[PDB]
Design a protein around this ligand. Structure first.
Ligand SMILES: NC(=[NH2+])NCCC[C@H](N)C(=O)O
Ligand SMILES: [Mg+2]
Ligand SMILES: [Mg+2]
Ligand SMILES: [Mg+2]
Ligand SMILES: [Mg+2]
Ligand SMILES: [Mg+2]
Ligand SMILES: [Mg+2]
Ligand SMILES: [Mg+2]
Ligand SMILES: [Mg+2]
Ligand SMILES: [Mg+2]
Ligand SMILES: [Mg+2]
Ligand SMILES: [Mg+2]
Ligand SMILES: [Mg+2]
Ligand SMILES: [Mg+2]
Ligand SMILES: [Mg+2]
Ligand SMILES: [Mg+2]
Ligand SMILES: [Mg+2]
Ligand SMILES: [Mg+2]
Ligand SMILES: [Mg+2]
Ligand SMILES: [Mg+2]
Ligand SMILES: [Mg+2]
Ligand SMILES: [Mg+2]
Ligand SMILES: [Mg+2]
Ligand SMILES: [Mg+2]
Ligand SMILES: [Mg+2]
Ligand SMILES: [Mg+2]
Ligand SMILES: [Mg+2]
Ligand SMILES: [Mg+2]
Ligand SMILES: [Mg+2]
Ligand SMILES: [Mg+2]
Ligand SMILES: [Mg+2]
Ligand SMILES: [Mg+2]
Ligand SMILES: [Mg+2]
Ligand SMILES: [Mg+2]
Ligand SMILES: [Mg+2]
Ligand SMILES: [Mg+2]
Ligand SMILES: [Mg+2]
Ligand SMILES: [Mg+2]
Ligand SMILES: [Mg+2]
Ligand SMILES: [Mg+2]
Ligand SMILES: [Mg+2]
Ligand SMILES: [Mg+2]
Ligand SMILES: [Mg+2]
Ligand SMILES: [Mg+2]
Ligand SMILES: [Mg+2]
Ligand SMILES: [Mg+2]
Ligand SMILES: [Mg+2]
Ligand SMILES: [Mg+2]
Ligand SMILES: [Mg+2]
Ligand SMILES: [Mg+2]
Ligand SMILES: [Mg+2]
Ligand SMILES: [Mg+2]
Ligand SMILES: [Mg+2]
Ligand SMILES: [Mg+2]
Ligand SMILES: [Mg+2]
Ligand SMILES: [Mg+2]
Ligand SMILES: [Mg+2]
Ligand SMILES: [Mg+2]
Ligand SMILES: [Mg+2]
Ligand SMILES: [Mg+2]
Ligand SMILES: [Mg+2]
Ligand SMILES: [Mg+2]
Ligand SMILES: [Mg+2]
Ligand SMILES: [Mg+2]
Ligand SMILES: [Mg+2]
Ligand SMILES: [Mg+2]
Ligand SMILES: [Mg+2]
Ligand SMILES: [Mg+2]
Ligand SMILES: [Mg+2]
Ligand SMILES: [Mg+2]
Ligand SMILES: [Mg+2]
Ligand SMILES: [Mg+2]
Ligand SMILES: [Mg+2]
Ligand SMILES: [Mg+2]
Ligand SMILES: [Mg+2]
Ligand SMILES: [Mg+2]
Ligand SMILES: [Mg+2]
Ligand SMILES: [Mg+2]
Ligand SMILES: [Mg+2]
Ligand SMILES: [Mg+2]
Ligand SMILES: [Mg+2]
Ligand SMILES: [Mg+2]
Ligand SMILES: [Mg+2]
Ligand SMILES: [Mg+2]
Ligand SMILES: [Mg+2]
Ligand SMILES: [Mg+2]
Ligand SMILES: [Mg+2]
Ligand SMILES: [Mg+2]
Ligand SMILES: [Mg+2]
Ligand SMILES: [Mg+2]
Ligand SMILES: [Mg+2]
Ligand SMILES: [Mg+2]
Ligand SMILES: [Mg+2]
Ligand SMILES: [Mg+2]
Ligand SMILES: [Mg+2]
Ligand SMILES: [Mg+2]
Ligand SMILES: [Mg+2]
Ligand SMILES: [Mg+2]
Ligand SMILES: [Mg+2]
Ligand SMILES: [Mg+2]
Ligand SMILES: [Mg+2]
Ligand SMILES: [Mg+2]
Ligand SMILES: [Mg+2]
Ligand SMILES: [Mg+2]
Ligand SMILES: [Mg+2]
Ligand SMILES: [Mg+2]
Ligand SMILES: [Mg+2]
Ligand SMILES: [Mg+2]
Ligand SMILES: [Mg+2]
Ligand SMILES: [Mg+2]
Ligand SMILES: [Mg+2]
Ligand SMILES: [Mg+2]
Ligand SMILES: [Mg+2]
Ligand SMILES: [Mg+2]
Ligand SMILES: [Mg+2]
Ligand SMILES: [Mg+2]
Ligand SMILES: [Mg+2]
Ligand SMILES: [Mg+2]
Ligand SMILES: [Mg+2]
Ligand SMILES: [Mg+2]
Ligand SMILES: [Mg+2]
Ligand SMILES: [Mg+2]
Ligand SMILES: [Mg+2]
Ligand SMILES: [Mg+2]
Ligand SMILES: [Mg+2]
Ligand SMILES: [Mg+2]
Ligand SMILES: [Mg+2]
Ligand SMILES: [Mg+2]
Ligand SMILES: [Mg+2]
Ligand SMILES: [Mg+2]
Ligand SMILES: [Mg+2]
Ligand SMILES: [Mg+2]
Ligand SMILES: [Mg+2]
Ligand SMILES: [Mg+2]
Ligand SMILES: [Mg+2]
Ligand SMILES: [Mg+2]
Ligand SMILES: [Mg+2]
Ligand SMILES: [Mg+2]
Ligand SMILES: [Mg+2]
Ligand SMILES: [Mg+2]
Ligand SMILES: [Mg+2]
Ligand SMILES: [Mg+2]
Ligand SMILES: [Mg+2]
Ligand SMILES: [Mg+2]
Ligand SMILES: [Mg+2]
Ligand SMILES: [Mg+2]
Ligand SMILES: [Mg+2]
Ligand SMILES: [Mg+2]
Ligand SMILES: [Mg+2]
Ligand SMILES: [Mg+2]
Ligand SMILES: [Mg+2]
Ligand SMILES: [Mg+2]
Ligand SMILES: [Mg+2]
Ligand SMILES: [Mg+2]
Ligand SMILES: [Mg+2]
Ligand SMILES: [Mg+2]
Ligand SMILES: [Mg+2]
Ligand SMILES: [Mg+2]
Ligand SMILES: [Mg+2]
Ligand SMILES: [Mg+2]
Ligand SMILES: [Mg+2]
Ligand SMILES: [Mg+2]
Ligand SMILES: [Mg+2]
Ligand SMILES: [Mg+2]
Ligand SMILES: [Mg+2]
Ligand SMILES: [Mg+2]
Ligand SMILES: [Mg+2]
Ligand SMILES: [Mg+2]
Ligand SMILES: [Mg+2]
Ligand SMILES: [Mg+2]
Ligand SMILES: [Mg+2]
Ligand SMILES: [Mg+2]
Ligand SMILES: [Mg+2]
Ligand SMILES: [Mg+2]
Ligand SMILES: [Mg+2]
Ligand SMILES: [Mg+2]
Ligand SMILES: [Mg+2]
Ligand SMILES: [Mg+2]
Ligand SMILES: [Mg+2]
Ligand SMILES: [Mg+2]
Ligand SMILES: [Mg+2]
Ligand SMILES: [Mg+2]
Ligand SMILES: [Mg+2]
Ligand SMILES: [Mg+2]
Ligand SMILES: [Mg+2]
Ligand SMILES: [Mg+2]
Ligand SMILES: [Mg+2]
Ligand SMILES: [Mg+2]
Ligand SMILES: [Mg+2]
Ligand SMILES: [Mg+2]
Ligand SMILES: [Mg+2]
Ligand SMILES: [Mg+2]
Ligand SMILES: [Mg+2]
Ligand SMILES: [Mg+2]
Ligand SMILES: [Mg+2]
Ligand SMILES: [Mg+2]
Ligand SMILES: [Mg+2]
Ligand SMILES: [Mg+2]
Ligand SMILES: [Mg+2]
Ligand SMILES: [Mg+2]
Ligand SMILES: [Mg+2]
Ligand SMILES: [Mg+2]
Ligand SMILES: [Mg+2]
Ligand SMILES: [Mg+2]
Ligand SMILES: [Mg+2]
Ligand SMILES: [Mg+2]
Ligand SMILES: [Mg+2]
Ligand SMILES: [Mg+2]
Ligand SMILES: [Mg+2]
Ligand SMILES: [Mg+2]
Ligand SMILES: [Mg+2]
Ligand SMILES: [Mg+2]
Ligand SMILES: [Mg+2]
Ligand SMILES: [Mg+2]
Ligand SMILES: [Mg+2]
Ligand SMILES: [Mg+2]
Ligand SMILES: [Mg+2]
Ligand SMILES: [Mg+2]
Ligand SMILES: [Mg+2]
Ligand SMILES: [Mg+2]
Ligand SMILES: [Mg+2]
Ligand SMILES: [Mg+2]
Ligand SMILES: [Mg+2]
Ligand SMILES: [Mg+2]
Ligand SMILES: [Mg+2]
Ligand SMILES: [Mg+2]
Ligand SMILES: [Mg+2]
Ligand SMILES: [Mg+2]
Ligand SMILES: [Mg+2]
Ligand SMILES: [Mg+2]
Ligand SMILES: [Mg+2]
Ligand SMILES: [Mg+2]
Ligand SMILES: [Mg+2]
Ligand SMILES: [Mg+2]
Ligand SMILES: [Mg+2]
Ligand SMILES: [Mg+2]
Ligand SMILES: [Mg+2]
Ligand SMILES: [Mg+2]
Ligand SMILES: [Mg+2]
Ligand SMILES: [Mg+2]
Ligand SMILES: [Mg+2]
Ligand SMILES: [Mg+2]
Ligand SMILES: [Mg+2]
Ligand SMILES: [Mg+2]
Ligand SMILES: [Mg+2]
Ligand SMILES: [Mg+2]
Ligand SMILES: [Mg+2]
Ligand SMILES: [Mg+2]
Ligand SMILES: [Mg+2]
Ligand SMILES: [Mg+2]
Ligand SMILES: [Mg+2]
Ligand SMILES: [Mg+2]
Ligand SMILES: [Mg+2]
Ligand SMILES: [Mg+2]
Ligand SMILES: [Mg+2]
Ligand SMILES: [Zn+2]
Lengths: 64, 100, 149, 107
RNA sequence: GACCCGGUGAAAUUGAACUGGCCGUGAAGAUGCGGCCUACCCGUGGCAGGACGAAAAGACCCCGUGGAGCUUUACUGCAGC
RNA sequence: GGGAUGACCCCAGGCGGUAGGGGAGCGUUCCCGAUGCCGAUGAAGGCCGACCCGCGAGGGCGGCUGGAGGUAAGGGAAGUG
RNA sequence: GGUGGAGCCUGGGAGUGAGGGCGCGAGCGAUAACGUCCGCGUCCGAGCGCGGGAACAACCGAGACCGCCAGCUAAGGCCCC
RNA sequence: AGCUGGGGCUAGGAGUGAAAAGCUAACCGAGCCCGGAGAUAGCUGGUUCUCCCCGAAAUGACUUUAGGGUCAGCCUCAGGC
RNA sequence: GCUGUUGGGAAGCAGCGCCAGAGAGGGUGAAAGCCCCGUAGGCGAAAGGUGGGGGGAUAGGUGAGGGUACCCGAGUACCCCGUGGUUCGUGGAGCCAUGGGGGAAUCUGGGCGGACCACCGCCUAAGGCUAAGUACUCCGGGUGACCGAUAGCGCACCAGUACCGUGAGGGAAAGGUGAAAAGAACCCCGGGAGGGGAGUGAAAUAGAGCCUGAAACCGUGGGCUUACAAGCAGUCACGGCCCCGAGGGGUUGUGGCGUGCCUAUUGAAGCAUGAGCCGGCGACUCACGGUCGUGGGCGAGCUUAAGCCGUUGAGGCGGAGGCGUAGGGAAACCGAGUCCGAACAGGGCGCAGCGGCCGCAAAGUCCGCGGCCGUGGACCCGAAACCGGG
RNA sequence: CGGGGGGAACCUGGGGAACUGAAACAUCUCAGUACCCAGAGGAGAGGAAAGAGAAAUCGACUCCCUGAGUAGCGGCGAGCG
RNA sequence: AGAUGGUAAGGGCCCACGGUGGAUGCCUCGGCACCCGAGCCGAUGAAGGACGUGGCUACCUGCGAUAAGCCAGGGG
């Protein structure tokens, strides 16, 4: 049977137009009061995932 | 495309032959060899007869060296299978209108 | 031409890799599969695309973004596909969503929106939305834009 | 349903093939099961028998052996020539065996 | 009974065998490697020291995010009251 | 380097090897080639071979058995060692 | 400088994630262990193919494409085996 | 509180049990058959023709992880620089 | 379609002919278009069955404005409580169904459009019936790049049989003489079995314990060799004897060298595992989807799926749709740009063929082939155990 | 007048697990599948909108393709769809 | 003083022929898979059986005290 798109990924990540994996930045969900403004500020942005891990997270998205 | 490459090959060889009609065939094999004889079809070469005329296809279909086909079913394999290739201008015509 | 003459071009019908048939093949015994281990075993490893050996996975550890949807589900609002001017050079005269579909440019169900990456042509164009850039090019190139409802 | 025999006991037949090929005679019997036939003086074979009240002094006895039916061919009593069997529809309207060389009948 | 003769005739076991001893060596306990000593070929009745002898994919021990039985103020459920 | 292209020739250098990667081939069943060719002056299979070609897996040749089937160059598909 | 089965980059397929002896530097150990745990290296692993070491995976020598009843050498050896 | 023939009844988380977890068709801590079924097995084993080139690892980090795995490292192939 | 020919047998080779709407195949003493059963093409049913197509009946069918406000499917709709179904696991939880409670209305009615309210719309529950297109294959038939007696159904044969089990239940092994029995009269040794001649046959180590008859295993005869030797049994050199006709084959006396195969191991000849021996079965596949590579087709375009027609190993039609042509953003939304932002700032993810119109190349896409991955028993065999019905 | 029982699977209704997957496991999955029961038939079910759901449109039901592993569901885990 | 051959109870290798055994090759009524066709039976006693049944009859088939079979129509 055809492959099933892994939703755990399509809800977290997004494949660009060139073949890269871009997921939001980890750290600023909670426990943020004493964090920097630089640390809260920078973590509110996407980051290109490491090539090996992204390659895996695209085989889970066979139809996007 | 392979249905036009197939023919053309036999065309390069000159093994391709067309005919207006089949003079005097009416459903008897022997009515055909007399024809095929006069068309240079001696039997020394396997042939692909390609026409719509049923009687004709019925006359030679039992012949150990003739492949019959309604031109609506002309296919490469049968072409390559053979050493020559014959058609009605009709069968020739629809042919044109399929590779076009 | 002749059946015996019909080869495939070299390399277009490669052989196969038979494992487990002797020392010579270099694939015998362990069948190119290693020694012991869950990977040599039949069935094998959990989805290597995700699983990592127990630790929290790289993907499960990434945060989720945006709206994930809710039931009954998707909301229906008109959808727009944009086509660039240069892709419109091939036509003459009057362009509409239809022709751009049967040409292979605009998908069905979506609406037509013109973009500007190209150069306009003094053409009657009919669409559901243009871009600021696309218009200026389209009105400047002696064209006749025509919005829809 | 039935075993198709083009020959019946005991019209006159031509041993088409076999060691006794060419020889002629009557069909002394018809074996549908094995689809064979016995012909007079043909396929002769010597067979042994016990010193038995029927066969005192022991010895052997010449038996006539059966032949496969495809080996036998009928002889048209008209043209006297072995022929393939057609079948004619009289006005009886029975069907009768008739020579293919000439329209003669064969019974 | 065992042992000799006539009559019948199994078994587990068995990599293949042309299968000695001592001091050493070797995956640390050698008929099979090294050196030396000894030893003519094949058997029968015997004795059990070794082929880490046979048998049973160690009951012990740990390992497996194996199992199953029993237990409770372990967790969570069900009958029942 | 020749010559032009894998035509074969010359010069130089490389070539221990488990897991494992890669490449080129042999062989078995089957299909087109095949309404063909081989076959009773003997098919497939079987026993010998100190001969032939192949690095090798294997391919022919010959003799004995065997007694009705076998199947080429070139390609295709696997219950293929 | 270095043209090497050197290096950079993209991509496909793996296996490995139980190492061991030696040498030098340490810790742990008793300035014990064919002990153990790290570091540089080496070798066996995969070279249990060859010579030496009496015999012996890792000490000395030396990287086995194939054939010769040809020559020179390394470690080690030259009274006899 | 005996032994015994014959006809009967009670069964699988259920029956019987003067109690051993004994017995329930010669192995009962949950009978046997058939089915779900080719359960699962990160464990052991087994994996079949030839030649040719290269050729490892037994490390680090995380891992209810430690004899299994994800990424990197070391090997390989095609293309590019 | 006869003859002639070799042969046990002609269908083989040779000569001369013929049919063919039939040169599919199977038989005949071997290899047959024309010998037999058949094949193409046609024929055919008194009686039972069927009859979805044709014709005929019959039950059944049908108008419009006006007023009336009787009827329009009840413990039902509807509300709450407990559940089930739907992609919906209480979620914002509607819709369909209903075990418990309360409990209406008849078109100005009522259910619905994802809690709820309104606007706007769709429908008309609580009685029932209904062909075909769809599913399976004990049965009959056609056909296979399906098996060919350890294969193929468990059974090619008297098989769900013998045998095992109290019972449910388990479950085999076993095919072939020859063209034709012409299946060996009679005689001889023997109680017989069995054999020796005779005889049959093309062939009798085709003799029914039968086609071919391999290997382990057993035996008879012959050549070399062995009773002071030692050993993974072999390899190298030499010599003696035997055979075949400056060479080779078999054999082995002496001298040299030499630690089985496989497995698992840091490491085995290894006193670690497996295997007595031989022969046959026996383990990396398939379908869909994905991802690289590859041979081709077309190329800002490529491609069809179920199906319809055709064929009877003939292909063609079909554009619905899928991938691509534009991306960025959680989204509205903008768009060669867009997102965070007050920004004309900064940054993220993005944006642009070769020769002489032509040709050539290509993004992309489609079918093949190949390696690998996901889902399924997914390389093969193996548990102790769980569960359901008997 | 009718019913009762049989039929290889196929069909609908009343009931309805578990191993397994989630690399443990309870919600979850395996799956309303396997299995039991009643019924029917050559087919069974379903079926003529108190429907679908945004077209200001469609027009009973059944089946196949497609829509689509989209919308959504999910200890938002495995996975379901 | 010395040195060297011939023995083979049996064993071993090699060749020849046989015994056993039943692989291998050809064969095939049988089996497998797909497409089509076809589709219920039954108190008018089904499905499936027991016991019988022939001049002589162990089993298989066929049949039922009318028992390898009785009547009628069609085919051949
Ligand atoms: N007339 C025709 N279309 N004939 C086609 C061939 C039919 C059949 N296969 C034959 O060989 O006889
Ligand atoms: Mg997006
Ligand atoms: Mg965050
Ligand atoms: Mg925040
Ligand atoms: Mg937050
Ligand atoms: Mg701080
Ligand atoms: Mg700060
Ligand atoms: Mg901010
Ligand atoms: Mg999509
Ligand atoms: Mg896209
Ligand atoms: Mg031909
Ligand atoms: Mg023909
Ligand atoms: Mg292939
Ligand atoms: Mg494949
Ligand atoms: Mg290898
Ligand atoms: Mg390889
Ligand atoms: Mg393995
Ligand atoms: Mg591998
Ligand atoms: Mg692998
Ligand atoms: Mg292994
Ligand atoms: Mg392992
Ligand atoms: Mg491993
Ligand atoms: Mg398994
Ligand atoms: Mg596993
Ligand atoms: Mg969404
Ligand atoms: Mg004559
Ligand atoms: Mg005839
Ligand atoms: Mg005595
Ligand atoms: Mg005795
Ligand atoms: Mg051993
Ligand atoms: Mg000895
Ligand atoms: Mg020592
Ligand atoms: Mg010792
Ligand atoms: Mg010794
Ligand atoms: Mg010794
Ligand atoms: Mg030795
Ligand atoms: Mg020794
Ligand atoms: Mg003794
Ligand atoms: Mg003792
Ligand atoms: Mg002892
Ligand atoms: Mg004793
Ligand atoms: Mg002892
Ligand atoms: Mg010993
Ligand atoms: Mg002992
Ligand atoms: Mg024991
Ligand atoms: Mg034990
Ligand atoms: Mg064990
Ligand atoms: Mg074990
Ligand atoms: Mg053990
Ligand atoms: Mg143990
Ligand atoms: Mg434990
Ligand atoms: Mg645990
Ligand atoms: Mg663990
Ligand atoms: Mg426990
Ligand atoms: Mg109670
Ligand atoms: Mg009480
Ligand atoms: Mg090499
Ligand atoms: Mg070298
Ligand atoms: Mg090397
Ligand atoms: Mg390897
Ligand atoms: Mg290569
Ligand atoms: Mg290859
Ligand atoms: Mg090949
Ligand atoms: Mg083979
Ligand atoms: Mg043929
Ligand atoms: Mg043939
Ligand atoms: Mg002959
Ligand atoms: Mg001969
Ligand atoms: Mg064959
Ligand atoms: Mg062959
Ligand atoms: Mg031969
Ligand atoms: Mg034949
Ligand atoms: Mg062939
Ligand atoms: Mg070939
Ligand atoms: Mg071909
Ligand atoms: Mg197989
Ligand atoms: Mg196999
Ligand atoms: Mg280089
Ligand atoms: Mg290298
Ligand atoms: Mg390197
Ligand atoms: Mg790589
Ligand atoms: Mg590890
Ligand atoms: Mg270790
Ligand atoms: Mg390991
Ligand atoms: Mg380690
Ligand atoms: Mg270490
Ligand atoms: Mg150590
Ligand atoms: Mg040592
Ligand atoms: Mg050291
Ligand atoms: Mg020093
Ligand atoms: Mg030191
Ligand atoms: Mg030190
Ligand atoms: Mg230290
Ligand atoms: Mg030390
Ligand atoms: Mg240690
Ligand atoms: Mg360590
Ligand atoms: Mg290793
Ligand atoms: Mg070394
Ligand atoms: Mg090395
Ligand atoms: Mg060494
Ligand atoms: Mg070695
Ligand atoms: Mg060794
Ligand atoms: Mg050495
Ligand atoms: Mg040495
Ligand atoms: Mg030495
Ligand atoms: Mg070197
Ligand atoms: Mg010198
Ligand atoms: Mg010395
Ligand atoms: Mg000495
Ligand atoms: Mg009693
Ligand atoms: Mg009693
Ligand atoms: Mg009783
Ligand atoms: Mg009971
Ligand atoms: Mg139980
Ligand atoms: Mg039970
Ligand atoms: Mg029960
Ligand atoms: Mg109890
Ligand atoms: Mg029992
Ligand atoms: Mg018991
Ligand atoms: Mg239990
Ligand atoms: Mg019991
Ligand atoms: Mg059952
Ligand atoms: Mg299951
Ligand atoms: Mg388990
Ligand atoms: Mg082999
Ligand atoms: Mg490590
Ligand atoms: Mg980590
Ligand atoms: Mg943890
Ligand atoms: Mg440990
Ligand atoms: Mg890796
Ligand atoms: Mg390269
Ligand atoms: Mg003659
Ligand atoms: Mg003749
Ligand atoms: Mg034929
Ligand atoms: Mg035909
Ligand atoms: Mg034939
Ligand atoms: Mg033939
Ligand atoms: Mg014929
Ligand atoms: Mg017909
Ligand atoms: Mg008719
Ligand atoms: Mg009305
Ligand atoms: Mg009115
Ligand atoms: Mg009213
Ligand atoms: Mg639910
Ligand atoms: Mg809630
Ligand atoms: Mg609910
Ligand atoms: Mg809905
Ligand atoms: Mg209710
Ligand atoms: Mg109203
Ligand atoms: Mg109302
Ligand atoms: Mg409602
Ligand atoms: Mg409501
Ligand atoms: Mg509502
Ligand atoms: Mg609604
Ligand atoms: Mg609403
Ligand atoms: Mg309203
Ligand atoms: Mg509605
Ligand atoms: Mg109503
Ligand atoms: Mg109904
Ligand atoms: Mg119906
Ligand atoms: Mg229907
Ligand atoms: Mg059938
Ligand atoms: Mg066959
Ligand atoms: Mg076959
Ligand atoms: Mg058999
Ligand atoms: Mg069988
Ligand atoms: Mg056989
Ligand atoms: Mg029992
Ligand atoms: Mg019994
Ligand atoms: Mg049993
Ligand atoms: Mg039997
Ligand atoms: Mg026969
Ligand atoms: Mg006598
Ligand atoms: Mg006597
Ligand atoms: Mg006597
Ligand atoms: Mg006798
Ligand atoms: Mg005799
Ligand atoms: Mg004679
Ligand atoms: Mg002869
Ligand atoms: Mg002969
Ligand atoms: Mg013979
Ligand atoms: Mg014979
Ligand atoms: Mg035969
Ligand atoms: Mg025999
Ligand atoms: Mg024999
Ligand atoms: Mg002898
Ligand atoms: Mg002495
Ligand atoms: Mg001597
Ligand atoms: Mg020498
Ligand atoms: Mg000479
Ligand atoms: Mg020596
Ligand atoms: Mg020697
Ligand atoms: Mg050595
Ligand atoms: Mg050694
Ligand atoms: Mg071990
Ligand atoms: Mg070990
Ligand atoms: Mg040893
Ligand atoms: Mg030993
Ligand atoms: Mg072990
Ligand atoms: Mg082993
Ligand atoms: Mg045994
Ligand atoms: Mg074997
Ligand atoms: Mg395999
Ligand atoms: Mg594979
Ligand atoms: Mg398969
Ligand atoms: Mg596949
Ligand atoms: Mg692929
Ligand atoms: Mg194309
Ligand atoms: Mg197209
Ligand atoms: Mg920007
Ligand atoms: Mg930029
Ligand atoms: Mg092109
Ligand atoms: Mg492709
Ligand atoms: Mg892969
Ligand atoms: Mg599965
Ligand atoms: Mg598998
Ligand atoms: Mg098993
Ligand atoms: Mg199992
Ligand atoms: Mg349990
Ligand atoms: Mg339990
Ligand atoms: Mg019924
Ligand atoms: Mg149900
Ligand atoms: Mg239950
Ligand atoms: Mg469970
Ligand atoms: Mg499972
Ligand atoms: Mg899983
Ligand atoms: Mg599962
Ligand atoms: Mg589980
Ligand atoms: Mg698990
Ligand atoms: Mg558990
Ligand atoms: Mg479920
Ligand atoms: Mg049900
Ligand atoms: Mg009932
Ligand atoms: Mg029923
Ligand atoms: Mg129907
Ligand atoms: Mg109905
Ligand atoms: Mg109605
Ligand atoms: Mg879609
Ligand atoms: Mg899709
Ligand atoms: Mg989540
Ligand atoms: Mg479900
Ligand atoms: Mg002797
Ligand atoms: Mg003697
Ligand atoms: Mg010897
Ligand atoms: Mg023999
Ligand atoms: Mg025999
Ligand atoms: Mg064959
Ligand atoms: Mg047959
Ligand atoms: Mg059958
Ligand atoms: Mg099917
Ligand atoms: Mg029926
Ligand atoms: Mg009658
Ligand atoms: Mg009658
Ligand atoms: Mg009549
Ligand atoms: Mg009559
Ligand atoms: Zn006549």
């Amino acid at each position: 049977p055809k492959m099933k798109t892994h939703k755990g990924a399509k809800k977290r990540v997004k494949i660009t137009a060139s073949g890269k994996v871009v997921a939001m930045k980890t750290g600023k969900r909670h426990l943020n009061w004493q964090k920097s403004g630089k640390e809260i500020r920078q973590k509110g942005r996407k980051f290109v995932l490491a090539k090996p891990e992204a390659e895996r997270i695209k085989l889970l998205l066979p139809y996007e | 495309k392979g249905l036009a490459m197939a023919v053309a090959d036999r065309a390069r060889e000159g093994k391709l032959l067309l005919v207006e009609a089949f003079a005097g065939v009416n459903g008897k094999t022997k009515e055909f060899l007399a024809w095929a004889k006069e068309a240079g079809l001696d039997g020394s070469e396997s042939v692909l007869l390609v026409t719509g005329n049923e009687l004709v296809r019925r006359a030679a279909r039992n012949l150990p060296w003739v492949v019959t086909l309604a031109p609506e079913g002309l296919n490469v394999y049968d072409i390559v299978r053979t050493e020559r290739l014959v058609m009605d201008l009709d069968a020739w015509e629809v042919f044109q209108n399929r590779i076009g | 031409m002749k059946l015996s003459d019909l080869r495939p071009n070299p390399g277009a019908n490669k052989r196969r890799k038979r494992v487990g048939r002797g020392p010579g093949s270099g694939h015998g015994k362990t069948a190119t599969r290693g020694h012991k281990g869950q990977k040599s075993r039949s069935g094998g490893l959990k989805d290597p695309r995700r699983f990592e050996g127990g630790r929290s996975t790289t993907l499960m550890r990434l945060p989720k973004r945006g709206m994930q949807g809710q039931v009954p589900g998707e909301i229906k609002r008109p959808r727009y596909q944009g086509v660039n001017l240069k892709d419109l050079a091939r036509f003459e005269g009057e362009v509409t969503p239809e022709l751009l579909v049967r040409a292979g440019l605009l998908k069905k169900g979506y609406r037509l929106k013109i973009l500007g990456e190209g150069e306009a042509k003094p053409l009657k164009v009919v669409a559901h939305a243009f871009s600021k850039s696309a218009l200026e090019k389209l009105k400047a190139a002696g064209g006749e834009p025509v919005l829809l409802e | 349903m039935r075993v198709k025999m083009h020959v019946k006991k005991g019209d006159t037949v031509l041993v088409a093939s076999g060691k006794y090929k060419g020889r002629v005679g009557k069909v002394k019997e018809v074996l549908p099961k094995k689809y064979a036939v016995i012909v007079e003086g043909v396929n002769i074979v010597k067979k042994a028998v016990r010193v038995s009240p029927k066969y005192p002094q022991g010895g052997f006895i010449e038996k006539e052996a059966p032949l496969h039916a495809s080996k036998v061919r009928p002889i048209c009593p008209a043209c006297g020539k072995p022929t393939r069997v057609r079948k004619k529809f009289l006005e009886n309207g029975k069907k009768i065996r008739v020579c293919a060389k000439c329209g003669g009948a064969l019974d």
